[PDB]
Design a protein around this motif. Structure first.
Motif: not given
Ligand SMILES: Nc1ncnc2c1cnn2CC1CCNCC1
Length: 458
Positions: A18-25, A42-50, A163-164, A170-174
């Motif tokens: 959720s929210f992005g890709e996970v990379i092993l670093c 660009r893909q994900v907006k923030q709901k709260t301030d800094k 929204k995509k 899966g999300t709707a079930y839970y």
């Protein structure tokens, strides 16, 4: 003013969360391996301030519990957030469970005790999940004794969900009914856990439907039953806990901490195997994963149409002489220019990642890396490395769903798959009719691939 790539290098991709890709670093000095979630602004907006985000991160880094993912560091730059935490290698809980011969209420109780233990702890610290689901439950390692680690706890409060549909499988079930309507609190996590427990013991979602909105309509009405055959295998106390956790009014719903003290948790974590539940969870899992893979394949085909033409125009412009010839440094510069405009590839963290990728494409094409190269040939190869990769992911998911090794998916199964994928019923039938002109009522893999290409404008 600390930079992420000054400290960590990307080893490989771990997958999509959720929210992005996970990379092993890996830390460039200490060698410490970490799972880095990369969130695109660009893909994900923030709901709260800094200020609210930094304070929450600061709290989360200090929290420690064996059933909760450990967060180490947080970074931020012009286009991304980087959530740096501990790597887990056991994979998703449900994928481990479908690989077992037996599974009883004792096993389910031990799993739910772990999840309830983690939730209780975070609730004590005023952190709510909201999006708790099987994909957010990872086993710490491959060991049979591995603890469950809940991931993404606290994130949804600060970032807006996609929204995509490719991000929503899966999300709707839970989701708890009160989250749909706007007034929710920590009790929403007990509901989601109740849904997970319902599925562990029966293998079917309590709230189901032919598409996402039909599922949401069922959740919102909040009515479920214990009338299936496989529920007769289950103790009354398991069904009693589930009833308390799936109580509609949150004030009347059991808390996480009180759920730990419930008779069922106390008895079964101190019996027959549920063969029918394992069967249904395996089918559920295969169905969910093929819809995901279908949506991801359709996406990567669109991403490719976009990137191919963009990269060609970047190089054409770069080719000031106009003879189609560029050198390795020019190819690297143009590929980096593509990353600035798009910002899609999480694994191209810095300049040194893109240099390696250029070299991988050059070594495939069989052209010398120290002279000048034909750029049109480079563009074809570089894009096919993402195109063929996604093509093989889809196929593996097709084979896994086809558990009978029949080579075919029936029309009933396509309805289920496209229902989960939320592809309009009339739309896929049309695409099927275009390719299935023998009225077989079924498709093999290539025919399925062809449908998906037709369902993303190709
Ligand atoms: N902490 C982690 N360790 C390993 N992989 C991880 C994480 C966090 N996210 N991911 C990526 C997987 C990718 C497959 N779906 C479950 C999450």
């Amino acid at each position: 003013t600390a930079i992420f790539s000054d400290r960590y290098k990307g080893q490989r991709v771990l997958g999509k969360g959720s929210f992005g890709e996970v990379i092993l670093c890996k830390d460039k000095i200490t060698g410490q391996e970490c799972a880095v979630k990369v969130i695109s602004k660009r893909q994900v907006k923030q709901k709260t301030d800094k200020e609210s985000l930094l304070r929450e991160v600061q709290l989360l880094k200090q929290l420690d519990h064996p059933n909760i993912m450990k967060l180490y560091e947080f970074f931020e730059d012009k286009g991304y957030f980087y959530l740096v935490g501990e790597v887990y290698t056991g994979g998703e809980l449900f994928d481990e469970i479908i690989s077992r011969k037996r599974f009883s209420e004792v096993d389910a109780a031990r799993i739910i005790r772990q999840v309830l233990s983690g939730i209780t702890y975070m609730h004590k610290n005023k952190i709510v999940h909201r999006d708790l689901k099987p994909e957010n439950l990872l086993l710490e390692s491959k060991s049979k004794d591995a603890n469950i680690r809940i991931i993404d706890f606290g994130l949804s409060t600060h970032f807006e969900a996609s929204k995509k549909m490719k991000d929503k499988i899966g999300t709707a079930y839970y989701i708890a009914p009160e989250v749909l309507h706007g007034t929710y609190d920590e009790k929403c996590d007990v509901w989601s856990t109740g849904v997970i427990l319902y599925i562990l013991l029966s293998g079917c979602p309590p709230f189901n439907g032919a598409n996402e909105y039909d599922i949401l309509k069922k959740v919102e009405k909040g009515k479920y039953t214990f009338e299936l055959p496989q529920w007769k295998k289950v103790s009354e106390s398991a069904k009693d806990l589930i009833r308390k956790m799936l109580t509609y009014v949150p004030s009347m719903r059991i808390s996480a901490r009180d759920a730990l003290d419930h008779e069922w948790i106390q008895t079964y974590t101190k019996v027959p195997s549920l063969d029918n539940a394992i069967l249904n969870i395996r089918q559920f899992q295969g169905t969910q994963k093929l819809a995901q893979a279908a949506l991801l394949y359709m996406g990567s085909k669109l991403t490719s149409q976009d990137e191919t033409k963009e990269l060609t125009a970047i190089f054409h412009k770069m080719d000031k002489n106009g003879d189609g010839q560029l050198d390795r440094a020019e190819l690297i510069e143009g590929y980096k220019e593509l990353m600035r405009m798009k910002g899609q590839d999480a694994s191209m963290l810095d300049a040194s990642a893109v240099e390696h990728e250029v070299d991988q494409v050059l070594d495939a094409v069989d052209f010398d890396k120290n002279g000048y190269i034909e750029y049109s040939e480079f563009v074809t190869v570089a894009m096919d490395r993402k195109t063929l990769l996604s093509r093989e992911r889809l196929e593996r998911a097709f084979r896994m769903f086809d558990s009978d090794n029949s080579g075919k998916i029936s029309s009933t199964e396509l309805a289920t798959i496209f229902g989960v994928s939320d592809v309009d019923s009339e739309t896929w039938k049309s695409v099927l009719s275009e390719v299935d002109k023998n009225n077989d009522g079924e498709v093999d893999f290539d025919e399925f691939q062809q449908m998906l290409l037709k369902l993303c404008g190709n």
